[PDB]
Amino acid sequence: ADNLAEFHVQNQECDSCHTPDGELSNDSLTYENTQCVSCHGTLAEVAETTKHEHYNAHASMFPGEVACTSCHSAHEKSMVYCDSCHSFDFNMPYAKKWLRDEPTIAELAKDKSERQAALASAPHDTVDVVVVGSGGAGFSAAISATDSGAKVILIEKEPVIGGNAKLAAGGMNAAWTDQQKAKKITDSPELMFEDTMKGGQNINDPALVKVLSSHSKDSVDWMTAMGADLTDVGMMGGASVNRAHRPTGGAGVGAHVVQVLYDNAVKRNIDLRMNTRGIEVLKDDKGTVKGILVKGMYKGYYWVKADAVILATGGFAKNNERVAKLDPSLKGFISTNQPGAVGDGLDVAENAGGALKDMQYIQAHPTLSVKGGVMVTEAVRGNGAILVNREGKRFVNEITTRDKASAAILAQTGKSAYLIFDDSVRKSLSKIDKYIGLGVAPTADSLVKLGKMEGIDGKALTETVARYNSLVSSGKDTDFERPNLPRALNEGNYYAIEVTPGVHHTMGGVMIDTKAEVMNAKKQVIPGLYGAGEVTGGVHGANRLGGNAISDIITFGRLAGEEAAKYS
Numbered sequence: 013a014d015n016l017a018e019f020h021v022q023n024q025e026c027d028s029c030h031t032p033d034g035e036l037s038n039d040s041l042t043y044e045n046t047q048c049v050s051c052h053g054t055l056a057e058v059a060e061t062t063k064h065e066h067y068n069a070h071a072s073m074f075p076g077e078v079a080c081t082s083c084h085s086a087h088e089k090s091m092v093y094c095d096s097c098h099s100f101d102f103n104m105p106y107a108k109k110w111l112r113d114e115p116t117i118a119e120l121a122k123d124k125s126e127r128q129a130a131l132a133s134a135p136h137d138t139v140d141v142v143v144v145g146s147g148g149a150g151f152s153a154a155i156s157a158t159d160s161g162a163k164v165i166l167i168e169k170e171p172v173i174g175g176n177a178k179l180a181a182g183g184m185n186a187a188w189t190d191q192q193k194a195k196k197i198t199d200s201p202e203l204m205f206e207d208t209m210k211g212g213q214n215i216n217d218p219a220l221v222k223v224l225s226s227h228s229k230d231s232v233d234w235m236t237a238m239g240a241d242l243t244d245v246g247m248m249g250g251a252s253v254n255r256a257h258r259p260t261g262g263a264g265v266g267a268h269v270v271q272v273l274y275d276n277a278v279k280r281n282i283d284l285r286m287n288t289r290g291i292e293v294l295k296d297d298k299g300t301v302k303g304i305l306v307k308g309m310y311k312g313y314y315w316v317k318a319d320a321v322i323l324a325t326g327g328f329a330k331n332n333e334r335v336a337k338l339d340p341s342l343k344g345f346i347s348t349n350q351p352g353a354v355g356d357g358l359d360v361a362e363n364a365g366g367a368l369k370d371m372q373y374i375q376a377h378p379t380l381s382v383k384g385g386v387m388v389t390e391a392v393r394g395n396g397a398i399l400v401n402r403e404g405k406r407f408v409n410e411i412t413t414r415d416k417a418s419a420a421i422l423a424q425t426g427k428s429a430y431l432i433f434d435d436s437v438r439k440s441l442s443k444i445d446k447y448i449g450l451g452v453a454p455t456a457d458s459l460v461k462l463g464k465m466e467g468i469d470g471k472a473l474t475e476t477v478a479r480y481n482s483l484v485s486s487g488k489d490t491d492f493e494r495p496n497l498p499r500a501l502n503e504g505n506y507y508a509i510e511v512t513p514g515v516h517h518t519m520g521g522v523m524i525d526t527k528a529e530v531m532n533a534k535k536q537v538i539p540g541l542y543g544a545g546e547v548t549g550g551v552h553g554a555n556r557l558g559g560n561a562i563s564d565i566i567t568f569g570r571l572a573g574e575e576a577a578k579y580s
C-alpha cells in the first residue's frame with residue numbers, strides 16, 4: 013500500500029473519510045479531519061499511543077487544533093511538519109522527506125487561465141475585511157475588526173496557525189504597566205521609546221515607534237483583558253529595565269499568546285481558513301481595494317470581495333536567498349523561523365502598489381542552539397546566564413544589542429560560544445526546562461567537569477564564573493559593562509548550551525503609517541489596504557529589541573483591524 017487512503021480502502025469505504033457527495037469540505041479539511049478523530053481519537057489521545065520519553069509526534073507546543081492532515085495526506089505520501097526544524101527519529105507511515113518548495117507569487121503568474129476564470133466568476137464570499145496570515149498580528153486584527161462590527165475572513169497558507177508568533181519565548185515589551193508596577197519595576201513609554209530608538213540606531217520611524225511605546229501597556233492590557241498571563245517581566249538585550257512580559261514563572265509567551273487569540277477568534281465564530289494563501293490584492297477602477305484572490309490548496313483559486321485587506325504575513329527570515337541578496341554576510345546561516353516565513357506576503361503587498369523600506373536590515377538572533385538548530389531565548393541571558401568562549405572566558409556584555417552580540421559570538425573560536433548558567437537561573441525561567449528537555453543543555457556538578465564535557469578550558473571557566481560572581485556581588489561589571497547583573501551563578505549544578513547566530517527577523521517590509529495603512533513609493537495611502545506586524549518596515553529600524561516584535565504585532569494588528577473596520 014503506497015499511500016494511506018489506499019492502505020485504508022483495503023477494508024473501508026470511501027465515505028468513512030468523505031462527505032456524501034465526496035467533495036472536500038473546505039481547504040481546512042474540517043469534515044475529513046473530524047473523520048480521522050472519530051476513529052483514532054483526538055490529537056492528545058493519539059499521542060498517548062505514540063510516546064517516546066523525549067519526543068512525541070502528536071504532542072507539542074503548537075497552539076490551536078492541529079489537523080491530522082497537517083502531516084498525513086490521504087492519497088499521496090507526505091511530510092512530518094516537525095522535520096522543518098527538528099530531526100526526531102520518525103516512522104511516519106507514508107512519509108516522504110521534508111522539503112518545502114512553494115511557488116513564489118511571481119511563479120503563480122503561470123496560472124492565468126485558472127486565475128482569469130476565478131476572477132470572472134462571482135466572489136466566493138462577500139465580507140467587510142480579509143486578514144491574511146494567522147500569526148499574532150493576524151488574529152489581533154481579525155478580533156479588533158470583528159469587535160469594531162466588521163465581518164472577517166482570516167486566511168493562513170500553512171496547515172497550522174500561529175506563524176512565527178507561536179514560537180515566541182522571552183516576551184512582550186510593554187511599559188509602564190501595572191505588571192512592572194507590581195514587580196517593582198519603574199519604566200515610562202518614553203524610556204521604552206528611547207530604548208527602542210537607540211536600539212534601532214535612530215533609523216526607526218519615530219511615529220511608528222511612538223505608537224509602539226504609547227500603546228504597549230494598552231496592548232498588554234488588551235491581551236490580559238482577553239485571557240493572557242503577562243505578569244513575569246524579564247530583561248532582554250538593549251532595554252534599560254525589565255519589561256519583557258511572559259507568563260508567570262518565565263514560560264514561552266508565544267504559544268500562549270497565540271492560544272489566547274485563537275480561543276478569542278473561536279469565541280466570536282471568526283471564519284478561519286487554513287491551506288489558503290493570499291495571492292493578489294484586487295482593486296477597483298479608482299484604485300481602492302475591492303477584494304483578494306486566494307489559492308485554496310484543496311479547492312483551488314477563488315476570490316473574496318471585501319472593502320479592506322489586512323496583510324499580516326510576517327517576515328522573510330526563512331528565505332536565505334532573499335536574505336543573502338540583501339545581506340551577503342547572512343548567506344548560509346540557519347534560520348529560527350517557521351517554514352513558510354519567506355516573504356510572499358511582501359510580494360503581495362508590492363504587487364498592490366505598497367512600497368518597501370528598511371529591507372537590508374535583517375536581524376540574526378545571537379543564540380541559536382548549535383546542537384538543536386533551534387533558537388535559545390535571550391531571556392536565558394536576561395535572567396542571568398553569561399556567555400563564554402572556548403577559552404572559558406567571557407567576551408561580551410550578554411544583554412547588549414543583537415547586532416553586537418552576534419558579531420561578538422561569530423568572532424569567537426570556532427564561531428560559536430556557550431551560554432553558562434546554574435539552577436538559580438534555570439529555576440527563574442521555566443522555558444530552560446524545555447532546552448534541558450531537548451537535550452541541548454549539558455550539565456555537571458562543577459565547572460571543571462562541564463568544561464571537560466563540552467570542550468571549554470575547565471579551570472579558566474571556573475575562574476571566569478567566580479570573577480563574574482564577585483562582579484554580581486559588587487554590582488558593577490567592570491569587564492564588559494553589562495548593566496544588569498541579576499544573579500550570582502552559584503546555586504546547584506551548572507549547564508552549558510552551545511550557541512551561534514541564526515537568521516531571525518526582517519526589520520524592513522511594507523511602508524505603513526500610524527493607522528497601519530499601506531502607502532506607495534510617493535507616500536500615498538492605498539485605500540482599503542493595511543499592514544501589521546513583521547511584514548512592515550519602519551518600526552524596529554536597523555536593530556530590533558528582544559521583546560518588541562510581539563508588542564509590535566499586537567498593537568499594529570489591533571489598530572489595523574479597527575482602522576480597516578471603520579474604513580469599512
Ligand SMILES: Cc1cc2nc3c(=O)[nH]c(=O)nc-3n(C[C@H](O)[C@H](O)[C@H](O)COP(=O)(O)OP(=O)(O)OC[C@H]3O[C@@H](n4cnc5c(N)ncnc54)[C@H](O)[C@@H]3O)c2cc1C
Nearest residue numbers: 145147148149175176177181182183290326545546561562
Ligand atoms: C523562534 C522565534 C521566537 C521569537 N521570540 C520572540 C519573543 O519572545 N518576543 C518577540 O518580540 N519576538 C519574538 N520573535 C519574533 C516574533 O515572534 C515575530 O516577529 C512575529 O511572529 C511576527 O508576527 P506576525 O503576525 O507579524 O507574523 P507571523 O507570526 O510570522 O505570522 C504570519 C502568518 O502569515 C502566514 N502567511 C504568509 N504569507 C501568507 C500568504 N500569502 N497567505 C496567507 N498566509 C500567509 C504565515 O504562514 C504565518 O503563519 C520570535 C521569532 C521566532 C522565529
Ligand code: HEM
Nearest residue numbers: 016019020024028029044047048051052080081084086105
Ligand atoms: C485522513 C484520515 C485518517 C488518517 C490520517 C488516519 C491515520 C491513520 C494512519 C497513519 C494509520 C496507519 C497506516 C499504516 O499503519 O500503514 C491508520 C490506520 C488505521 N486507521 Fe486510519 N486515519 C484516518 C481515518 C480513519 C478512519 C475514517 C478510520 C475508520 C473508519 C480509521 C481507522 C483505522 C484503522 C482501524 C487502522 C488500523 C489499526 C487500528 O487502529 O486498529 N482511520 N490510520
Ligand code: HEM
Nearest residue numbers: 016017018020021026029036044081084085086087088310
Ligand atoms: C477509493 C476511495 C476514495 C476515493 C474515490 C476518494 C476521492 C478523493 C478525491 C477525488 C480527492 C481529491 C479531491 C479534490 O481535489 O477536489 C480526495 C482527497 C482526499 N481524500 Fe479521498 N477518496 C477515497 C478514500 C479516502 C480515504 C480512504 C481517505 C482517508 C483515510 C480519504 C481522505 C481524503 C483526504 C483527507 C483528502 C484531501 C487530500 C489528501 O490528503 O490526499 N479519502 N479523495
Ligand code: HEM
Nearest residue numbers: 048052053054055061069079080082083092093102103104
Ligand atoms: C488526531 C490527529 C492525528 C491522527 C489521528 C494521526 C494518526 C496516526 C496514527 C494512527 C499513527 C500510527 C501510530 C501508532 O499506530 O501507534 C500515526 C503516526 C505518526 N503521525 Fe499521526 N496522526 C495525527 C496527527 C499528526 C500530526 C499533526 C503529525 C505531525 C506533526 C503527525 C505525524 C505522525 C508521525 C511522524 C507518525 C509516526 C510516529 C513515530 O515514529 O513516532 N500525526 N499518526
Ligand code: HEM
Nearest residue numbers: 066067068069071072093094097349350386387446449450
Ligand atoms: C509536532 C511538531 C513538533 C514537535 C512534537 C516538536 C517537539 C519539540 C520537543 C520535543 C522539544 C524539546 C522541548 C519540549 O519538551 O517541548 C521542542 C523544542 C523546540 N522546538 Fe519543536 N517540535 C515540533 C515542531 C517544531 C517546529 C516546526 C519548530 C520551528 C518552527 C520548532 C521549534 C522548537 C524550538 C524553538 C524549541 C525550543 C524550546 C521552546 O522554544 O519552547 N519545533 N520541540
Ligand SMILES: O=C([O-])[C@H](O)C=C([O-])O
Nearest residue numbers: 181182389390558559560
Ligand atoms: O529570545 C527570544 O525569546 C526572542 O527571540 C525574542 C525576540 O524579540 O526576537
Ligand code: NA
Nearest residue numbers: 519520521546
Ligand atoms: Na519587518
